[PDB]
Structure formats: C-alpha cells, structure tokens
Design an enzyme around this catalytic site. Sequence first.
Site, short mmCIF file in Angstrom:
data_model
loop_
_atom_site.label_atom_id
_atom_site.label_comp_id
_atom_site.label_asym_id
_atom_site.label_seq_id
_atom_site.Cartn_x
_atom_site.Cartn_y
_atom_site.Cartn_z
N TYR C 332 -1.10 -1.66 -6.35
CA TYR C 332 -0.25 -2.21 -5.29
C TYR C 332 1.19 -2.58 -5.65
CZ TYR C 332 -4.77 -2.90 -2.89
OH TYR C 332 -6.00 -2.82 -2.26
N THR C 333 1.51 -2.63 -6.93
CA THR C 333 2.85 -2.98 -7.36
C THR C 333 3.70 -1.73 -7.43
OG1 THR C 333 1.83 -4.65 -8.77
CG2 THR C 333 4.18 -4.23 -9.04
#
Lengths: 404, 405, 405, 408
Positions: C332-333
């Site tokens: 998700y980063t």
Amino acid sequence: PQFDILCKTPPKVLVRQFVERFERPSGEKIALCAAELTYLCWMITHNGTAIKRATFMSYNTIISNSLSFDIVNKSLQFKYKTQKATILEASLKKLIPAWEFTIIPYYGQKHQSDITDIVSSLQLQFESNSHSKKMLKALLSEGESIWEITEKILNSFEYTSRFTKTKTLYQFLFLATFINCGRFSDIKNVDPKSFKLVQNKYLGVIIQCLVTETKTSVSRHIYFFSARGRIDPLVYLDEFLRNSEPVLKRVNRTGNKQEYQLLKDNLVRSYNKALKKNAPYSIFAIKNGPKSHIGRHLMTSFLSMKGLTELTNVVGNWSDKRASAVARTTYTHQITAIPDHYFALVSRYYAYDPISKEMIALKDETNPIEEWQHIEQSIRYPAWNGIISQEVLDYLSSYINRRI
Amino acid sequence: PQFDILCKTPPKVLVRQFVERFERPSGEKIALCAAELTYLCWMITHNGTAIKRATFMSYNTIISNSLSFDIVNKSLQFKYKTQKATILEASLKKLIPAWEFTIIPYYSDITDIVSSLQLQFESKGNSHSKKMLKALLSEGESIWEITEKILNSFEYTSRFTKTKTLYQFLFLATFINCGRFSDIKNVDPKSFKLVQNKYLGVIIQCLVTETKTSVSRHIYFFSARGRIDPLVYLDEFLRNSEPVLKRVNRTGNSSSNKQEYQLLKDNLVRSYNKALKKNAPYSIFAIKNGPKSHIGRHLMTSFLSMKGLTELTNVVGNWSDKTTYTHQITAIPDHYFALVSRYYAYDPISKEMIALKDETNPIEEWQHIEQLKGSAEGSIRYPAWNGIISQEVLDYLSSYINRRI
Amino acid sequence: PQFDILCKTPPKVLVRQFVERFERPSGEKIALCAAELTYLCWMITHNGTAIKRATFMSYNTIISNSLSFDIVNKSLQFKYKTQKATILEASLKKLIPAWEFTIIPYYGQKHQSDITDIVSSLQLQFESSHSKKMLKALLSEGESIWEITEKILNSFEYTSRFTKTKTLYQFLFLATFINCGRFSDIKNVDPKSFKLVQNKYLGVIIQCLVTETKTSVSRHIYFFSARGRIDPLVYLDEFLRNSEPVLKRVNRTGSSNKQEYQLLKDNLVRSYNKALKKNAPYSIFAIKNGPKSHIGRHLMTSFLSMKGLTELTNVVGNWSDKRASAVARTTYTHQITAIPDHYFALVSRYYAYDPISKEMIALKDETNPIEEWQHIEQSIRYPAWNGIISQEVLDYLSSYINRRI
Amino acid sequence: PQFDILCKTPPKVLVRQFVERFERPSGEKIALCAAELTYLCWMITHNGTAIKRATFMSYNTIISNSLSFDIVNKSLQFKYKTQKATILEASLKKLIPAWEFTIIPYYGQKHQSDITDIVSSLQLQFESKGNSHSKKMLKALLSEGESIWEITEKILNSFEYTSRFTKTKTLYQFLFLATFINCGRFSDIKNVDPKSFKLVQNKYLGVIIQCLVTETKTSVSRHIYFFSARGRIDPLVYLDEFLRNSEPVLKRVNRTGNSSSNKQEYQLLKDNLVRSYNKALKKNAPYSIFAIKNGPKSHIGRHLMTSFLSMKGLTELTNVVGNWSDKRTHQITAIPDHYFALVSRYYAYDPISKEMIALKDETNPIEEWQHIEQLKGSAEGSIRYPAWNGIISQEVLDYLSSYINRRI
DNA sequence: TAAGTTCCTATTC
DNA sequence: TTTAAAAGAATAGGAACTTC
DNA sequence: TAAGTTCCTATTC
DNA sequence: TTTAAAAGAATAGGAACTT
DNA sequence: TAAGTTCCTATTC
DNA sequence: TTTAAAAGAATAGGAACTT
DNA sequence: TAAGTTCCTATTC
DNA sequence: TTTAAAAGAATAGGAACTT
C-alpha cells in the site's frame, strides 16, 4: 483431602509403598497409586522442589484418566505435563526395574470427537468466555451505574440467606473484592494479625492488612474504609467480625509461618451457588461465567470509565514488566502502594476532575476527617481480640456509634 | 445462494442426504456432494465450530475442481486445506464403510525452471499494477487533487441519483478511514454517536464488529475545509438510501444475531467496481485484478508515509501491532482528524498542528450550533433513518448542513 | 566482468555447458564451472528468481574456496548459503546423475586458527570498535563538523593529479555529507531526474532520484545554496563541467525496466578511498577496514544528533520504516517520505536552530537567498549534460554562478 | 598478583614455559601449569582476543580445583567453560604430541538428580536457606516503620564514630551515598574518570554535576551524578569532604590486551576500598541484614534505590537509573530530569497529575543557583581542592567551592 | 438499449 | 540489512439476467 | 591494638 | 499467568600481614 | 426443607 | 491477514451428603 | 613516476 | 548478567597494471 495426607506421609515411607504395589502385582494396588505417582514425578523432574496444592490436584486428575498398565507384560503409562519424559523414564525405571513406563503428553485443550458425536451436537444446537464478556459489556451500558449494579447484587443476599452468618459472609466477600479489586483468594488468604491503621489525606485513616499467598505470588495490601452514602464498608466489616471467627491457615504445599487466614476455603462454593440462584442479573446465569471474579471485573470497569485505567494495574496487583527480570527477582523488596487519591474516589466523598485533575470535595454535612477527630480523642468484637490489633478494634468500635 | 440454503437445513438432514448419495452409486448424485462434503470436512476438523460464508465458498470451489471418483471400485478423492488428512479420511470412511477416501493437499523442477527462464531470455500482473500505482502518485497531482477527480468521475456518469450518491459516499468513506468495503458495509447504523475532538469540536463516530480479522474498529465522518466535505456526502447518502437487514454470514445459526441492520448492501461492491472501471480518470483502474474499491486504502496509506506519519498507519488502517476481559478498541489520535480535516497543517519541526489563517474556525461554528436548541428538523429530512440513528446526530447534521452557504 | 557475461549467456546454453564438464571428467573443466554452479544453485532454491550482482559475486567467492570434487569416485563439495541442502541435492542430481554432490554450510569462515598462528600474532602485537572510538573523540575536540569537513574537503585540492578527479572526489564527499548518503546513493542517481523544487527558506533547490539502494527503498538527493566559504552549488557546477554522463551498469540476471545513465562511475569509490587513505587529514582514515566514503554519512549523522534533531536523521538517511505493518509497507505504500523544509535551512547556514521555542532564526547577513533567487528568476555552459539534464535546471545553475561573486 | 605478572610476560615465553613442563615431566612443574593453561585455553577459543582480569581469575580457580594427570600414561584433564572441547583438546595435543588431553565441562547437568539422593534429602527435611533468609531480612528492613531516607541516615551515621581516620570515615560515607543516589555498583563509582566532571543544567535544580564511567560490568557506559538536597543529607557536602581528604588514583590495567589505548589515566577510588568498606559495614550497620553471610554489603545502595522506585510506582525509571538492558558513535541514554527533582527532596511527585510539585519551603534551589552563577572570579575553588587541581575542570571546583561556602 | 444485479469462480490479502 | 509456510477470509472478474 | 590491606577462593549476578 | 541454560564478569569472604 | 459442605473434576487464567 | 505450545495455578461445577 | 584502474577477495552492514 | 543464526548486499582491500 488426600493432598493433606501426602504432606503428612514421610518421603521414604512413600517411595516404599510405591514399590510395594509391584511385588504384589494387582489391578487394585496399582490403580490407586495415582497420588503417589504424581508426587513422585514432580520431585523427580523438579529436583525435590515443593509442589503447590492446586498444581497437584490438577496433575492428579490428569493421571487418573490417562492411567494404563500392562496386564502381564509389565508396562505402564499415563499423561503428565513434562518436557523431560526421557529422564523421568530412566528415573521411574530405577524404582521398579522389572517394568517399562511410558509418559504420554497432555493436549487437554483439544480432543477430536466422533462424527456421530459432532453431528449429534450440531443438530441439537440447531433446534435449541466470549458470550460472558459480551453480557458484562452490555450491562455497563444500560442505565444503571456500577454503584447501582453493586447495590442490587449486595442486597440480593439479604433475604435469601438461611443463616445470619452466611448473609454476613457473602455480603462481606462481595463488597470486599469490589473495593480491593481482588480475587477470592486475595480476600481469603489475608493474615488477620496484620490489620493496622494507616493515614490518608482525605479520609483521615483507614484499615489495612496483608495477603502473601497470591496467584502471581506477589504479595499485596487489602483495605477497608469509610464510604459516604447508603453503603459503608466499615459497616459490613463490623457485621462480618461479629458473626464470624478466625480460621486455621491451611497448608498449601509439600514443604515459614502464618497460623490464621481471614476466611474459609469452601466459602467460595456457597457464594457461587448463592449468586447462581439468587442471580440479580442474567450474566450469572451463564455456565462457567464469572461468579466471584465479578467483584473484580466490576471495579475494573468503574476505574477505566473514569480514565483512571493506569490506576488499575496497581489496585489489581498486575505483575510489573517495566523493570528487568533480575531487578524484580533480587532487588525489589517493597511492593507498590495504592495512591491516596484512589480511596477518595471510592469513598464517594470526592469526585475526579478529568480536566484540571483534582479530587473535588462533594458538598455534604458529614466530614470524614472530623468524624475522625472526635473518635480520636475493645471487646465488642470478641474472638478477634488478641489476634486483631486492639488499635483497630478500638477504632472500628467507636466509629459504629459516633456515626449514625 | 448455496450457503444460505445450507444454513437452513438441519445437521442431521445434511448427513442423511450425503449417505443417501452412495447407496445408489450413480455419478449424478455423487457429483453434487461438494457443498455437503465441504460442510462435513470442516465440522470434522473443527469439532463442530461454525463456518463463515466466505470461507465455505472458497473451500467448496476447491473441491468442485478436484472431485474425482470410481463407482466400480468405490473410491473418491479431492483437495482440501488441512494437515489432519488421516483423521479426516478415516472419519469419512466411517460414515460410508464400503468406500476409500483420499484427501489431496491443496498446496520446482530444475528444467521446468530452465525452460521458463529460457523462454524469458528470448522474449507480472502485480508488477504492472504497482508500477502504475507509483506513477499515479509520483507525478504532479496531490492526494487531495486525485480524490476530487475520482470522486467527480461519478457526477454525470451514473444512471440514478441513488447510485451517484452511494458511489461518491463509499469512496470518500474508504479514503477517510483507510477502510475496506466491508469496514463500511458492516457498520451498525444504531451505533452513530457525537464525540468531541479538541480540534473540530465534534466528530461523528460509528462502530463495526464483523471485520476481516475480527478486531472491531470505529468509522468516522467530519467537517473539512474546501470543496470536498464528508458531512455533505453523508447528507446526500442518508437522504437517498435506507437501512439494510443484516445478512447472516456464519453457519452458527446462533440466537445471538445482535446487529439488526447494516449500512450498505453486499452487492454494491460489484456495481461500484464496474463504474470505477469504466470511468475513473486513471490508467491504474484498467489493469485486470488491480485495486478497485480498495483504492482508498492505498491512497491514505501512502499519504501518511509521505507526511512522515507512519506511526498512525496500523491504527488508522486497523493492522495488528505487536486485560482481555471486556476488550476496548484502540482509538485514533485526535490530531489525525485535524490533519485530514484540512483546517490545520502538520508542522514538522514542532510536531504540532497549526490552524490556518483562514477566517472562520471550526471550533467556533460548533459552538454557534450547539447553541440553538430544539431542532426536530433533523427528523424531517432523514425519515428512513428515524428511530435507528440517534436523534442527537440527525439533528446535528441537519443543523450543520442548513447553516452552510 | 564475468557476471556481465553470465547475464548474456542463455539459460539452456548454460545448463548445457555444465553437463559438458562431466562427460569429459577433468580437473580443468570442472574447476572453472565456479560461476555456473553459483547461477544454478540460486535459480534452483529461489524458483528461477533473478539474482543481484553483488549477491552473486559474494556467493561465487565462497564456492571457489569450498570447491572439492572426488578424483574418481564421483561427487562434489562446496559451501553455499542455503537452508535447503536437501532439495538442492535432489535437483543437482537430476542433472549429472552419475555423481554425488554435497552442500557444505558457511560459518563466516570463523575457522579456529592454528595455535602457532594465534600465538605468533599475540607475540607480535605484544612488542609493537577502535574506529567508533576515534570518530567519537574527533567530534569532541575543538573543531566543529563544519571545520572537520573543510579540512577534509580542501585536502584534495593539491593532492590531486589531474583536475577531473579533484572535481570528483571533492564533489562526492560534500555530496554524501549533505544528503547523509552512502556511495551507491550518490552513484546510482538518475541524472534525467534533476528538477527544481521549492523551499520556504532558500526559495528553490535542485532535486534528483536514486532507485537502486541497499534497502531497495528509493530516495531523493539534494544540492543547494550554502552561505559561507562553502557552497554545494559551486562544487556541483565544477563537477558537471569536468565530468560527463555514465552508462548505467546492469546489476542482476533479469527484465525490461530502464535507466540508461547513472550519475557516477562504479570504480570512482576506489580512487576515492586511496585518496582519503594517503591524503588523510585525520588519524581515523589511517585505521584499516575503517570508514572511508561512509565518513560523509557518519559526519552528517553526528551533526544532526548534536542539534537534538536526531529524529530528523532517520528520514535524511533513508532508514527503513518499522512503525507501519509489514503488508502495509509492501502493498500500500506508493510514496516515500520527504525531507522536511526546515532541514536545508539549517545546513545552508543561513539559519540556526532554536532548541527552545523551536524555530529557524535567520542569521544576519547581506546576501538573502530568496532575493538572489528573485533576480536570477526574471544553457550550454554545461555541454554534454544538456538534453539529459533538464534545461530548467542547467538554466538555474548557470545564472547563479554569475549573479553571485 | 598472578594476572599482573601474566600481562608482563611475552606470549612466546608463556607457551615455552608451558610445553617445557611436559618435556622431562615432573609432578611439581605440571601442577603449576594452571595459569598458563587458563591463558592458553582462552586464546585458543577466542582466536587471540584479550582476557579480562576477573574472568581470568575465575577460570584459573576452576582449573586448580580440577587438574588431574598421569605422568606415567601422559594424560591430563580439567574443567573449563566451553562448547568447543574437541577443538581445544586437539589444539593442545598439537603443542604437546605425546599427551592426551581431556576437557571436562564445568556445568549443571543439574545435580545428578538421583531419585534416591533426592528422596534422602526430602526425607532428611521431613524430620528436621541463605538466599531465602537474605530476602526475608531485606523485606523487613523496608516494610517496617522506617522510610528509605531514615534508613539512609542511620547507615550513613554508623560510620561517624567508628572510623579510625577521617580519610576512611570520608570514603565510606561518600561511597554509600553515591551508590544509593545512582543505584550503582562499587565498580560504577570506582571506575569513574576524574577528568570527566561537568556542570549540566537541570530545569529543577539549575545545575547538576556529571561524570562518566566506561569500564562497567556489561560494558555499557553510564553517567554518575551529585547534586543539592534539602535536609540533613546533602550529597554535595559529602562530595566536598571526599575531595579534600583523598587523591586521584592511577588507572589499574585490567585486560591482557596490553593495548596502546589505555586512554583513561586516573580512576576515582581504589579497587581495594571495597574490602575495608564491607568489613566496616558488617561490624557497624544498625540492621540485621548486614550480618548474614554472603549478603549484600556495598551492593545495598542498589537494593534501596530500586525498591524506593517500585514503591513510588515509578518502575519506568528503573532500568535507566540502574543501567539494565531494556530491549529497544554511540551515545548513552540520559536519566530524566524529574528523577533528580524527586531525590533532591526539594520537590514531591504528584500521582494524580504525574508532575513534580515544589515544596512551600522558603528558599528555592533554582534561585540560589542564580545567586551563585552571578559573582565571578572565585579562584578559591583551586585553593581548597589542591590534589584535584588540573584534573577536574576549574568550573566545577569553583562551583562546589561557592556552594559549600555559601551555606550556613 | 446498458448500468445494475445475482450468484459463483478466480485472486489477493 | 532481512529473514516463513499455510489455513482463513476478503476483494475483483465472468455470465446471464433485470429494468426507478 | 584492631582497623585496614593484599591477594586469592567462593558466591552471585 | 509464565516460560532457559551456560559463558562472562562482578561482589563477598578467608588468612595473614601492616601501620 | 433446600440452603450449605465435601472433595475431586472441569475450565479459565 | 495473522502467527507459540506448554507448564504452572486459581476459579466454576458435579454429585452425594448435612443440617 | 605514482596517482588512478581493473577485477576479484575480504569485511562490514 | 545477557541471550539468534543465516541469508542477502554494499563498502574496504590486495595486487598487477595504466597513463
């Protein structure tokens, strides 16, 4: 109670009888060594270290069910909580060298059932821990306050009590746990000879005592004080002492002193049955749910809901973790003391100021320090005198009168 | 749906119907034993513990693509996730004595590797997916600009106002809380509350229990300075939708349903994903198997990494971060809302929140609103949520919305 | 450079040659498959996943020393970092089945020397950690980091034979110290990414990007205007003029991702170490196996901590984050943390940090950053870098070197 | 002392002296091989890494009580702490080819846990502890009436009239107060470097004296402090009496590293002070704990402070104050300012708010610090602390000097 | 009409 | 400087219908 | 004198 | 609710001297 | 009475 | 997504008795 | 020359 | 008291050459 017996039975006297069941091979002399087998295994694996009462009866129950000896091949086995089945084997061998013992593991937690069994249950449940927590979770969130929920629980013992002694016991124990946020054992094992008056910058003085034998083995203090309102701890203590008498401290291991203990060991049974039937709430109807532990959960909640959760750890005697293992083991020689502003909040004479963080005095005509100043300037509790500090029996007595 | 029917039939009927299939050894009745078998294998390996909807479906499919048998010899095999096969096989043979059951575990030749490596030397679905995600963020546009574009790709492309409404609300809600579709869908309507935050005065809070990891969390809505205001979107949603009966999703067939309603419809995700796929103004959205409704999780997560605030991540997104009786969930820190509300700015140096010179401060308006009392109006504009959501909240939202020009 | 060769050698072409050393059993054809044996082992245990350059050469060196084959009883032995000797055996077998291979563990070659060897050393040392102590004492001796840097920086000016190297060394050093980076962090920079970014202190700055890092987490590299006897922009200028682009080297057995150029040469680090070694302006560089190029990092590290601004370190040095959950970081980063604006203000020397009120106090000077910025606001001085480096920047840099004496 | 001599002989000599013993074997020459053997076994298992004084001594003894040999069959055995025996034995046989070396593990395969040896002991017990008796007493010494601050005054005063010279009176008093104030060991104070004294400011007292120690039991450095305290017990006063009656001590070398990096020139106290101090304490401290064989003596300060914090519900400062490992150019973790506010006795810890409250008592310390920082040029410090002149920063000796003279 | 649904299969947390 | 394998439980995609 | 030292052995971190 | 075994490195005690 | 006890066994810390 | 398995110790329950 | 390069090996992240 | 062993990846060094 056989555990008591064992404690009395001499060691060699034991190692003997045990060997006396194999020269006379039978299904009657071997099927009973249950308790001996237990005591043996322990001392073997722990290098002759004492064993506690409960820890024994638990391990005892296990063997009874896992016991199996070979009819004529001379084999034997059972379940026992050990990571050293090997050595225990070699040790048990050098006792009755004519046999072959086998130590079976204990997975008590999980056992697979028969399909027809599992199915039978499922079908049943169809037509008919977690649950418990939910119930208590909802109770707190329903109009009534902890203080009200306690009152109903406390009063519910008033007319259901057969004797006057029990009414006094139950009623005490409950209010006891709630106030000290303790377990049953935390209240039972109290050493009466340790009652003493301590000071407080809010109520003037208080009654204090000590418990040494606890679950975490970390001793703690127990308190009793003056509460403003329709419930006064000192009052229930009074009523307790008068209808109750000292108790001979029971021995709890195969091993220091303490002759008396504040309460009886089986009191907890009649107290569970009481709450069970005389259940003033549905939560006590749940099987295996909290009974006596309720007093603790209740005070737990009360304190968290006030933001004062940190204060919980102390009051509930939670094992510390901040200080290093060795520092706690060889350098800690004094237990943490409950902060003075704790009782001010539980005495109901004050309230907590979540913001400025202060104990606001609640407008009332009865001042704790003044009812204290007058009674400051004996044998009402017989049986407890000579055991309980006169200093205290004197304090308690004059309080019951000076205050209407 | 299979699972629902299965939750209806009594355990003893399930077994009968299963044994029934082998008395007259015929392909026809055996091939349809998949659901029964799935239900059965679980209850055996879990000593009667309930099975969840999703888990059941997953397992069923694994059996269907693997069920193989021989009526002559009477042998049957299939795949299933478990360590305890022997126990399972045995248990099955009991129920049906004349058959042999074999469980195959659903779970690197040097040449198969050399081949693939070689076939590669001459010429991922995830790699291409990350690539795009990196770009969609690296380039010019900021998170707040990207949110406005996605959120607007719905404004004139939907068939009815009702769908326009949901699609917009659901996206903003997943971004604002860094939540999943289920995190918003499974919200209990009766749990809405007004909670005060020292930066905005009040904040709307609701709860969710049935979550992927079974760890409860809160869901919020609040005021935001700019063109994108959560409360506004909440307003449009409530007026165009209605509560939804809680769907049961455990074979527990328990008397403890507790939760009566839910916030959204389980099927919304399918229509939402399609709309997104056909209209979002970004290439990421056209990659097969790529994040769709899960996009808001990627957006917020990244935002915090960039802002050097990764200490709020696990708590905002509800990930595990290494007094059980009556458990209470970890709360999200007040500053988080100060930041996302766009009224304040995070100051690196001091690590404090600085309000913006902009005139009207939110704490103020909260006060102007808490003032005037007796606004039964809340009840008038949110009829379908009357009696479900606390009157306090509908009256507040009602007041906020009407007091904003 | 054989690794390069391998990369070019086809897979099947390799599995072939390897089997071609056992049909013709010799001590010459087998004692050279060192590199092939390596490449094989990896793809085997890693299921055909690429291998990094440095990771390869390390494992290679190991086999070389641990290679031992049975003269005539068929078998092979060597050390290789694996926890699956078993499977790698079964795989290696199905290649040249006529033999019996054996995988030997690797224990950081901590081989108990011979007593006579140990004693010999001891006796020697008698008649005749440390690194950290030295650097520990240097910081605590009158001179400031800014002074210690000056002496290190200037010590290259005449010690340098040519003029290009003086330009390189001198650049690299100041480079690392400013970006608190390693050698690779400066080498791998992709020139095509230089661009101007803003700052509420210096007006603008030069920014570029490094992707291939030790932790594989990309980062930004900066260059700005410093007030005083040292100005980074000046050393950059001097760098560009005497230096030219470098073809990005291939670092693994992969793919089609790109980047053709890398800011510096690979062997530059060698002549840079030897330079500091001999031209050592401090005793710490005399220590064997001590910090050479890493010195630039350690220095800036200290500078920052001593200002209380230790937290600010993690970011500047690109330390791997740990607060956010593993999966959150993994899927998700999509945006890296950005260095705070008040950072460069302190390293530009135009300001100072206020440990108390926590502010950047402007230091009274006649030369204003933003004004020297405002004038140059209202080309081909750096040939060879044009068409590769953004004109926007080459234009900025040029006019700055002049407007400023 | 054996170790010291060993640090003097060159490696080639030892090994020589050693092998010699076995070539023309005599009972006398072999029995004296213990030191040489210890040194040898360590250098073998650590590829030449240095051996520490304490560790060497400890290992030597284990060998002395276990060395056994047959000059006839040329076999020799002994105990030694290590996993790598084969490697060690082999290595030894090399040096001396015609002998067989057998290493026996100094361990705890636990008591040879014979069921009967256990039954006997358990039985001998059924008819009829040092570690236990010791704790018991410690619990009492704290539980009873007296507070930590009262207990400290009594112990500290048990030195006032029984000390023979003023010099010893001075050390014993200072050493105790310093171990309690920092929750440190003897070595933590002894190994202090005199040249590291500094004035550091604390927001509650204005200034605090700080010094450093590197050679510690776990090899993790820490600071040691001294400060003002309201009441009859004032650290600075005791510091004052110590400095005037003692002198610096040359750093004793305690590693066979024979390194050119001694760095530290002096140390604060004498290694042998602990023995005289322990005796004094054993014969005069007004508490029974002090009469139990093998009980805490100089280590008493650690027990006191540790406990104080537990009671005060401040166990979050423990590991950092006593310097224990807390699972997280190195810099050491500093002790929080409030800690000194509490122990200085000028402030009180408020539970409810968790803040320090100054006491109504007139003169505030922050104030006096200011009255002192004012007047400048007090070369007086140099006059009353001659033996520490040039070693301890002039700033500090002038400060202590001013504090002490400005207090009536 | 095609955006929305419904009810599974395939993929990714 | 980083490190795993496998049961569990969601989210994304495929077809064939429905219809403010 | 008897507290203090010195230099190892026994114990406890 | 708590959980270890073993190499390393101090602190406490025993004798025989010193001052 | 039908609330209390005993003394292990079953569950939950 | 999330992740330890066992040993060591009190708190409920079951069933036959007691008052 | 002797400061720089090559291309692996030895150490330190 | 203190406590993980290995795999995966850059940063110094060694020795023969190059300008």
